[PDB]
Amino acid sequence: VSNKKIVFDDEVSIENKESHKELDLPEVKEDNGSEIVYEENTSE
Amino acid sequence: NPLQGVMKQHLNPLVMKYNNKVGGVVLGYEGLKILDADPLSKEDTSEKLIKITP
Amino acid sequence: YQRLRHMVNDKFQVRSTGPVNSLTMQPVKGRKRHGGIRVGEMERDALIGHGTSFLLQDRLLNSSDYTQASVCRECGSILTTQQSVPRIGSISTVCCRRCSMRFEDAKKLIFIDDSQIWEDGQGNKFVGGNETTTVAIPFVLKYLDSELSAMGIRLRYNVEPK
Amino acid sequence: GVHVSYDNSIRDADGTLVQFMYGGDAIDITKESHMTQFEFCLDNYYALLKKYNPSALIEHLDVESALKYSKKTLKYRKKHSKEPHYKQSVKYDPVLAKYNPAKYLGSVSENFQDKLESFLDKNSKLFKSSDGVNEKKFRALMQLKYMRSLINPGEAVGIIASQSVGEPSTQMTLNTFANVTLGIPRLRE
Amino acid sequence: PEDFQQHEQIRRKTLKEKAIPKDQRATTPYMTKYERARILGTRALQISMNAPVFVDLEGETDPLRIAMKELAEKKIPLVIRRYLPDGSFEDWSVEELIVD
Amino acid sequence: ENERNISRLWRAFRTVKEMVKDRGYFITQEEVELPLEDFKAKYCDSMGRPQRKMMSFQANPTEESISKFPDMGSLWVEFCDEPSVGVKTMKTFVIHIQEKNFQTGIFVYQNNITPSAMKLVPSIPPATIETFNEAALVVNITHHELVPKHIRLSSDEKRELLKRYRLKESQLPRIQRADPVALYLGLKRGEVVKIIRKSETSGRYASYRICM
Amino acid sequence: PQNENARAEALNLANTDSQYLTPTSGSPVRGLIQDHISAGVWLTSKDSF
Amino acid sequence: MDISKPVGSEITSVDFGILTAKEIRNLSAKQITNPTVLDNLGHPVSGGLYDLALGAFLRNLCSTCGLDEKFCPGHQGHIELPVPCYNPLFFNQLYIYLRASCLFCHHFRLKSVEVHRYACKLRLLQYGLIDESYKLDEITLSSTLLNELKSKRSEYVDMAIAKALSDGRTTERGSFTATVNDERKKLVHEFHKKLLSRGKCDNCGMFSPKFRKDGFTKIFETALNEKQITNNRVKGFIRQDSTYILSTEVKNILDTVFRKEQCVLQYVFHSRPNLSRKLVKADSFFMDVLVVPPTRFRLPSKLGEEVHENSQNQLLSKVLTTSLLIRDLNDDLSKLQKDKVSLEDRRVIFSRLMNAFVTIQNDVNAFIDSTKAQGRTSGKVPIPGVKQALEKKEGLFRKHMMGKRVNYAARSVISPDPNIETNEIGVPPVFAVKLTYPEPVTAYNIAELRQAVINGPDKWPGATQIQNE
Amino acid sequence: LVTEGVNFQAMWDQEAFIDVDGITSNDVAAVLKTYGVEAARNTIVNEINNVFSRYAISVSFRHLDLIADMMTRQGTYLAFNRQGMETSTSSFMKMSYETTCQFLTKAVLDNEREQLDSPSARIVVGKLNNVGTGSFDVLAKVPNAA
Ligand SMILES: [Zn+2]
Ligand SMILES: [Zn+2]
Ligand SMILES: [Zn+2]
């Protein structure tokens, strides 16, 4: 398994990274008046 | 007017609609009573306590 | 006399509302993008020291990530509820995926009332799971509960009135 | 979560009792400055009486019980005054142990009781060259002052104690020039 | 259905066991600085949503100020429920507490 | 040059009497304040060496004690004469305690109790047994400026304290069963001590601790 | 603060005027400084008319 | 938060516990099985990590509730792990019980009488009965005597709890203060120390082979020593009436021990009385499924203009690939006929199985606690697992719960002013015009608020919006 | 007189020169071991006060007593560190102090209930604080209720 996983992870990593490369992110506002930001990094 | 208010806010809208909990259509209602939050008062008195949301 | 250069990004900022962060639904960090101002641990302690519980509630809940959310009174979860998807003409209701049976399995064990069946978007029918309400929680609680369930951990909120 | 409870004790949030009464005496530090400033309270007697308004409280306070008990204990505490602390009479607990300072006029710390009675004793002069203020009336007012200087049920005394040690210790970040450990290092030890 | 009745009776019974009767009250007859602030805020909230008001407004537009006025005349229909640390409680009416 | 040793024994003896009196038992004041000379007179052979076996004594509860603590038994104090405590001596002592029906035995050893013999300590319920080393009795800790007066409460006094503050037993501040003052007063688990502190702020001030 | 309960608290509990004495020792933290002290020595001088 | 949207229901307590694979499967909105996340047109791959049953994503609507990216709360799905894995959070505790076990009589190797003495004490502590738990130790009057001892200790515990309930001292919900919690924690520590302190089983007298671990959650079993194999067959007549060891073997061992030692475990795993009456199961230490959190908690990020995948998805897809790969090993494994299966093939089949278990267990570890994962492709730096997300820097609790960024506030340099009151603050109009307050409209303020609305957002004192009923 | 080092029993032999009843120490734990918890409590108060007195900082004994009563709440000498904190009934408060997943793991294995009484726990769940204005409930007196 582990040896097959290497090849399979590689091609999935490549595939998944390219998919995301031309994704298009749409603005979502609350009733509040609030844009929702897609970021995974509270860099405070 | 707490009884008036319970009637106009909650009970009246139940009339002639199906209600999932009694498992039928509610035709109407009798003998509304508020349970005093003061457990020490008599079921009699017309002065009662109602806890306010924080 | 010498005039000293500014060394500092002085510029003021104000936020009423504005962009929030995806995970916590709390004000983003920003200025140049309408970020919120932080009330951190020290200011928390100060607010407790005053005895001002509403000021604390205003800052760390109401004006931050306050959220009315559904709970199942029965299993005590805030993650397993959803809106039902109704037939046209009917009204949507709020249901718990944990506490309800797949329709088939429920038949396979008396008559089953109409108000007790609900459906999702895919089309599967369910029986039960109608003991829901709404509670006011900080949004970040949902995130924490979500992360915990990834780790196999379950939070169970006891709600009143039963 | 350590706070003053409605019973005057100091509790943690889980109910655990940390102290039985805040300073042994239930006094708010921020209402304390003038409690033993007797001569300042004797001039200014009349304004203080207006401020504290005893009329509005006669119906709601026990005016006799604590004063009577207080005298009983002043006697036993004096009658066994000079003998060492482990041979002390413990027949009579302090008033504050038995009577709620918020309800019973006269339920007061023994330090305060002493400081006050010493003043009245050593200053009979000021109760003639006064504005018509007699020794009895002044005792009552000072006793009422104590009552109105109590820490309030609900106070986050725990957070406050923390700030009253942490904040002032920022003034010890440096040092001057036995031989003991000082300042912050010691406070950490 | 039979047992919700039972559930209610238990709730109501324990609630009565926690209630300290009026004449056995033992806490301060003074309104606390905390009780005052919350009484004002909460009564102000009710005023902002058309609670019947028990005093003459005399041009006031701040609901907090209206509350303060009501407090001054002792016309605030609120009751403070003080909890002792075991969960038992004393009910004190705003009018009966000495305010300062 | 055992002059010290005798003085130290005389001193430890005083502490024991003081301790037994504080626990509620009938000991005269003159008995506590026994002058150094009288002590050698009563308890030394014509050899200057001190005879521990003569020091051992019985103590009965007082008037007030019987009323406040109805089941307070009689107490026996033993001064072992042997530098170490055999399991032989321990048994003989324990038998004495059980046979003549004492509620408490206090064993004042000189320096060594073999853990073989430490086994026999809870051996005879309902009766209870306590051990003290001599050198740690030279001074009465409860006489110290930093040690406020501890008073043991009766079950009635304790029930009333818990009621007045609506307390569960375990919400009280703790005093360790092996705390030096606990050991002095002979505290059992669950007993509550009232403590009269001197406050810098207040005068006298009563606090309490529960023994757990 | 965004609702009347929080208003009431900020005006009655955490308000500046409620905090004249510190809880550390119970002493003043608010007072005037510099110009105002110098000014006072002058304004309240016997030479002042 | 809006004073005109009151809430009636109130949360009063929270209970901690463990999700069972049965619950998860039932609540799940979709089983996820595809490592691939998007297709060539940027739509969610069905059965993949952005599957629309897990919630609305971008301009698509949620397939479970039908709501869009704004009103859809998200829904959880699950991955099916083809082989049980140790839950890394609990692996240390699992280790303790495993080591403590007797692989022969299936009790703990600690003598039953002692274990029962701990069960008695902990049970008493559920009711806060600290004094009683010490009195329990005061009880004494070879296997006939012991059962009477056990029995009389048992009747003491019952009598004490009964008595405690009749008077004030407890409820059926227990009593739990700090002093109680302290006594409880000591006992459990003492109990665990005594569990691991035994070699020969006090109950059947046999020796079990010793268990050893990794920092990467693998368990090795060291075969028996010479004196010990001798000792074991001497006891052979009475019973008549190194290697990697798979997680499945470990689970079977604990499954039985948990049945036998259930009494004590019932109190070791419950600080309060267990009213629910649920058994304490070994499964709680294992995971047969992984909960896939809702799509809104796993969104991509945009670093300016470029879009980056979600790191938790990168980890989950590695679980997915390994999963498919094991489902294939399992497929070829069944197509072996045992009439061709050697004695040597036994070794190779085991070799392949160990390989599969290890790497699935690694992929799970990597997702939950990157510490317990084997460092990847020497470089890259690890991707944070859930533990690291909660504990990043000061951590979720301190950075986003005990403190928060808030709405309705401002920051500025301060300047002195002798002309305002000592209790005022001089506010610049730039703030005064952006900060609002929600005033409810009434008879007493309709004049004022009329004017504000007329004044608009930009003339002070004005207004920026109106909330309708 | 002042000694570098602590040994009470040795000093108990110098009864001829010193009043043994008034010996005091720097060392809170020594005092605890020899004289008990109340003595140790006092020693903490005095020692903390000695720290501030040297810098002419004035701090009310009311704060000091509380800090010291807290430290001695278990009859022992508990610091404000992990060990002292570990006793707390609130798992959410521990989780927000040091090592979230450890305390969480402990809570789960105890099947703990968070009673939600600590300030930390209530902030976590969005509950009004127990201190101050949250330390009581408000109810409305309503007429015409029968
Ligand atoms: Zn449910
Ligand atoms: Zn959805
Ligand atoms: Zn065995």
UniProtKB/Swiss-Prot annotation, chain B:
Entry's localization field: Nucleus, Nucleolus
Residue numbers of the full-length protein present here: 56 to 109 of 326
Protein's recorded name: DNA-directed RNA polymerase I subunit RPA43
Sequence similarity: Belongs to the eukaryotic RPA43 RNA polymerase subunit family.
Subunit structure, interactors included: Component of the RNA polymerase I (Pol I) complex consisting of 14 subunits: RPA135, RPA190, RPC40, RPA14, RPB5, RPO26, RPA43, RPB8, RPA12, RPB10, RPC19, RPC10, RPA49 and RPA34. The complex is composed of a horseshoe-shaped core containing ten subunits (RPA135, RPA190, RPB5, RPO26, RPB8, RPB10, RPC10, RPA12, RPC19 and RPC40) where RPA135 and RPA190 form the DNA-binding cleft. Outside of the core, RPA14 and RPA43 form the stalk that mediates interactions with transcription initiation factors and newly synthesized RNA. Interacts with RPO26/ABC23 and with the initiation factor RRN3.
Other known facts: Present with 4070 molecules/cell in log phase SD medium.
Main function: DNA-dependent RNA polymerases catalyze the transcription of DNA into RNA using the four ribonucleoside triphosphates as substrates. Component of RNA polymerase I (Pol I) which synthesizes ribosomal RNA precursors. Besides, RNA polymerase I has intrinsic RNA cleavage activity. Through its association with RRN3 is involved in recruitment of Pol I to rDNA promoters. In vitro, the A13-A43 subcomplex binds single-stranded RNA.
Curated annotation (Swiss-Prot), chain E:
Native source organism of the sequence: Saccharomyces cerevisiae (strain ATCC 204508 / S288c) (Baker's yeast)
Record has Translocase as a keyword: no
Subunit relationships: Component of the RNA polymerase I (Pol I), RNA polymerase II (Pol II) and RNA polymerase III (Pol III) complexes. Component of the RNA polymerase I (Pol I) complex consisting of 14 subunits: RPA135, RPA190, RPC40, RPA14, RPB5, RPO26, RPA43, RPB8, RPA12, RPB10, RPC19, RPC10, RPA49 and RPA34. The complex is composed of a horseshoe-shaped core containing ten subunits (RPA135, RPA190, RPB5, RPO26, RPB8, RPB10, RPC10, RPA12, RPC19 and RPC40) where RPA135 and RPA190 form the DNA-binding cleft.
Region (Leucine-zipper): 57-78
Disulfide bonds: none
Keyword Nucleus: yes
Compartments it resides in: Cytoplasm; Nucleus
GO BP, one annotated term: tRNA transcription by RNA polymerase III
Protein name: DNA-directed RNA polymerases I, II, and III subunit RPABC2
Domain of life where this protein originates: Eukaryota
Function: DNA-dependent RNA polymerases catalyze the transcription of DNA into RNA using the four ribonucleoside triphosphates as substrates. Common component of RNA polymerases I, II and III which synthesize ribosomal RNA precursors, mRNA precursors and many functional non-coding RNAs, and small RNAs, such as 5S rRNA and tRNAs, respectively. Pol II is the central component of the basal RNA polymerase II transcription machinery. RNA polymerases are composed of mobile elements that move relative to each other.
Designated gene of the protein: RPO26
Shown residues within the full chain: 55 to 154 of 155
UniProtKB/Swiss-Prot annotation, chain F:
Name the UniProt record assigns to this protein: DNA-directed RNA polymerases I, II, and III subunit RPABC1
Xref: InterPro entries: Arch_Rpo5/euc_Rpb5, RNA_pol_Rpb5_N, RNA_pol_Rpb5_N_sf, RNA_pol_subH/Rpb5_C, RNA_pol_subH/Rpb5_CS, RPB5-like_sf
Any GO molecular function: DNA binding
Assembly: Component of the RNA polymerase I (Pol I), RNA polymerase II (Pol II) and RNA polymerase III (Pol III) complexes. Component of the RNA polymerase I (Pol I) complex consisting of 14 subunits: RPA135, RPA190, RPC40, RPA14, RPB5, RPO26, RPA43, RPB8, RPA12, RPB10, RPC19, RPC10, RPA49 and RPA34. The complex is composed of a horseshoe-shaped core containing ten subunits (RPA135, RPA190, RPB5, RPO26, RPB8, RPB10, RPC10, RPA12, RPC19 and RPC40) where RPA135 and RPA190 form the DNA-binding cleft.
UniProtKB keywords: DNA-binding, DNA-directed RNA polymerase, Nucleus, Ribosome biogenesis, Transcription
Pfam families linked to this entry: RNA_pol_Rpb5_C, RNA_pol_Rpb5_N
NCBIfam families noted in UniProt: PRK09570.1
Native organism: Saccharomyces cerevisiae (strain ATCC 204508 / S288c)
Keyword Transcription: yes
Transmembrane segments: none
Top-level taxonomy: Eukaryota, Fungi, Dikarya, Ascomycota, Saccharomycotina
GO biological process, one term: transcription initiation at RNA polymerase I promoter
HAMAP family, per database record: RNApol_Rpo5_RPB5
Compartments where found: Nucleus
GO cellular component, one term: RNA polymerase I complex
Swiss-Prot record, chain H:
Chain ranges passing through the membrane: none
Signal peptide from the UniProt entry: none
Annotated compartments: Nucleus, Nucleolus
Residues that hold Zn(2+) 2 according to the record: C102, C105, C201, C204
Binding positions (Zn(2+) 1): C62, C65, C72, H75
Its job: DNA-dependent RNA polymerases catalyze the transcription of DNA into RNA using the four ribonucleoside triphosphates as substrates. Component of RNA polymerase I (Pol I) which synthesizes ribosomal RNA precursors. Besides, RNA polymerase I has intrinsic RNA cleavage activity. RPA190 and RPA135 both contribute to the polymerase catalytic activity and together form the Pol I active center. In addition, subunit RPA12 contributes a catalytic zinc ribbon that is required for RNA cleavage by Pol I.
Similarity comment: family membership: Belongs to the RNA polymerase beta' chain family.
Oligomer status and interactors: Component of the RNA polymerase I (Pol I) complex consisting of 14 subunits: RPA135, RPA190, RPC40, RPA14, RPB5, RPO26, RPA43, RPB8, RPA12, RPB10, RPC19, RPC10, RPA49 and RPA34. The complex is composed of a horseshoe-shaped core containing ten subunits (RPA135, RPA190, RPB5, RPO26, RPB8, RPB10, RPC10, RPA12, RPC19 and RPC40) where RPA135 and RPA190 form the DNA-binding cleft. Outside of the core, RPA14 and RPA43 form the stalk that mediates interactions with transcription initiation factors and newly synthesized RNA.
Other comment: Present with 2840 molecules/cell in log phase SD medium.
Protein name as catalogued: DNA-directed RNA polymerase I subunit RPA190
